[PDB]
Structure formats: structure tokens, C-alpha cells
Amino acid sequence: VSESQLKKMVSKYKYRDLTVRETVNVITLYKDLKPVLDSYGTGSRELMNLTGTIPVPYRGNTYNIPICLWLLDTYPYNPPICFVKPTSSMTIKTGKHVDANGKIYLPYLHEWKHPQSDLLGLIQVMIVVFGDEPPVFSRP
């Protein structure tokens, strides 16, 4: 996805260059995260989200944890809405940082404030937190 393609996806966003800038930073460092424009809740509510996996080390090995980061049209002033997206080979683990719907809860999202808070910082936190408590486990 080129910068031009990203600009199109966020046409209705309030802070476009800022959203594109960070998205590029994210997909450049985390190559398995892909920007996708999809409807959220309502067919007319299209938002861009970063969907894919992030590398997380746990008890010895690295796992490609499936996530989805929805960027609201107010990004970066408001935090993204994040979810763990389990595949058929795994099961989501409800716990401290993951609720019944797979929504992620983190102090980083709770006190989110631009410009110090950003997606690179968020993903870094996820790698540390999920490395301690995986949000998904492979089926037996």
C-alpha cells in the first residue's frame, strides 16, 4: 500500500497527514500489518484499520499474534480501538487486558495523549504485555 493509496483511505479523517505518517511508520517496521478500509458497525461508517500479526516472544519462542487496530477519524488525538483476532487454530484468552469481545485494554490506551502517545509506542507495549500474558493460545 503506497502513501497515495493511504491518503485515499483517510479522505474523511480530521487529521489526515498525521494518520498517514504514523501508518507508514507502522507498516514499515511491522511488515505483517496491512492497512484496510472497511465498514465499522454501519455500512456507511468506513474506517481504516491495520490488520495482521505482530511478533511476540513467549516462554522461549516468537508468535505471530493476530490483531486489528481501528483508527478513528480523530486519530491521533483519540486512541485506536484494538482487538485480538483469533484464527481457527487458536482460542482467545479473556483476561486482564482482553475482554469478552477480544477488545484490548491497556494503560497506554487509557491515558492516550497526542503527540507523546503513538502507534509505534502502543505496539511496543503490546509486545511486552502479550509476551507476559498471551491473548490467544493454540487449540489442543
Binding site: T53, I65, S89, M90, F137, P140
Partner: peptide, 9 residues
């Protein structure tokens, strides 16, 4: 590439 998760525990 392919999503993976640690063994059930």
C-alpha cells in the same frame, strides 16, 4: 505471515 499462538496452558 501465518498467525500463531503458544500451546494451551
Amino acid at each position: 505471515p501465518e498467525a500463531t499462538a503458544p500451546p494451551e496452558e
